[PDB]
Amino acid sequence: PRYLKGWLEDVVQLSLRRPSVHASRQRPIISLNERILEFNKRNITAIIAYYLRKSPRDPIEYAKYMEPYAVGLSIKTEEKYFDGSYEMLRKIASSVSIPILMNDFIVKESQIDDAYNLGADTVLLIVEILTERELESLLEYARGYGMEPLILINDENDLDIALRIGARFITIYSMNFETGEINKENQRKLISMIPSNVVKVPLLDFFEPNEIEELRKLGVNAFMISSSLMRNPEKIKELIE
Numbered sequence: 001p002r003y004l005k006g007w008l009e010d011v012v013q014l015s016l017r018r019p020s021v022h023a024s025r026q027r028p029i030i031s032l033n034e035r036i037l038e039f040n041k042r043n044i045t046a047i048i049a050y051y052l053r054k055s056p057r058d059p060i061e062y063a064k065y066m067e068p069y070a071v072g073l074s075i076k077t078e079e080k081y082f083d084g085s086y087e088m089l090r091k092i093a094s095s096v097s098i099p100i101l102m103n104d105f106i107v108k109e110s111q112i113d114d115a116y117n118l119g120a121d122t123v124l125l126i127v128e129i130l131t132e133r134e135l136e137s138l139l140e141y142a143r144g145y146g147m148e149p150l151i152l153i154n155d156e157n158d159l160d161i162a163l164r165i166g167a168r169f170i171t172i173y174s175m176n177f178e179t180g181e182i183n184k185e186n187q188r189k190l191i192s193m194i195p196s197n198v199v200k201v202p203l204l205d206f207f208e209p210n211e212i213e214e215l216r217k218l219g220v221n222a223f224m225i226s227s228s229l230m231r232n233p234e235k236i237k238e239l240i241e
Contacts, residue, residue, distance in 0.1 A: 093119025
């Protein structure tokens with residue numbers, strides 16, 4: 001990975017030393033990008049429900065609530081800052097039958113092995129914390145499992161590296177990791193720069209209906225929604241309806 005500052009460097013250090021799990025996988029991969037494409041074809045609004053426990057609700061109950069509606073779940077497995085775990089990942093992936101994104105700070109191959117062995121269907125990769133060669137190598141490694149990883153971009157330089165290595169599945173955070181805040185203006189700009197054959201997923205804390213169709217008409221394939229659904233989980237039924 002690169003050398004970073006602040007909590008993010010602590011997390012990268014922690015991730016580098018994270019022990020690998022001895023679990024072996026319990027069910028097939030349920031492809032997240034492919035299910036999004038299927039939902040697009042069928043005109044079903046595609047929502048990744050984003051859970052996390054803490055940042056710099058019961059996770060199983062959340063996952064079961066969202067299962068009938070979400071295109072996938074994002075499950076945070078970073079431990080120190082987000083209070084995530086591998087065991088919770090495992091127990092969600094064994095409890096619901098929709099795709100699971102392992103949302104973490106992946107800086108080595110064994111973390112992708114951990115994702116596969118725990119039941120996750122794909123992993124997050126973050127351009128900002130990796131070199132281009134690392135990103136490419138981790139991209140190919142994930143694809144070895146049948147996982148198209150979800151590539152996180154925060155700015156146009158991140159986008160350009162993602163496209164340079166051939167990414168096919170991108171999440172647009174447009175986030176300053178120092179503040180945890182999303183630049184929604186930049187997000188719209190970046191979405192408008194991504195080629196049509198890349199599955200594109202903005203992260204939204206809140207939405208309004210106007211905003212959802214304006215983004216759909218920019219070609220967005222799915223929406224990953226955090227705060228609104230933690231507050232009001234029932235909103236995902238409205239989104240599907």
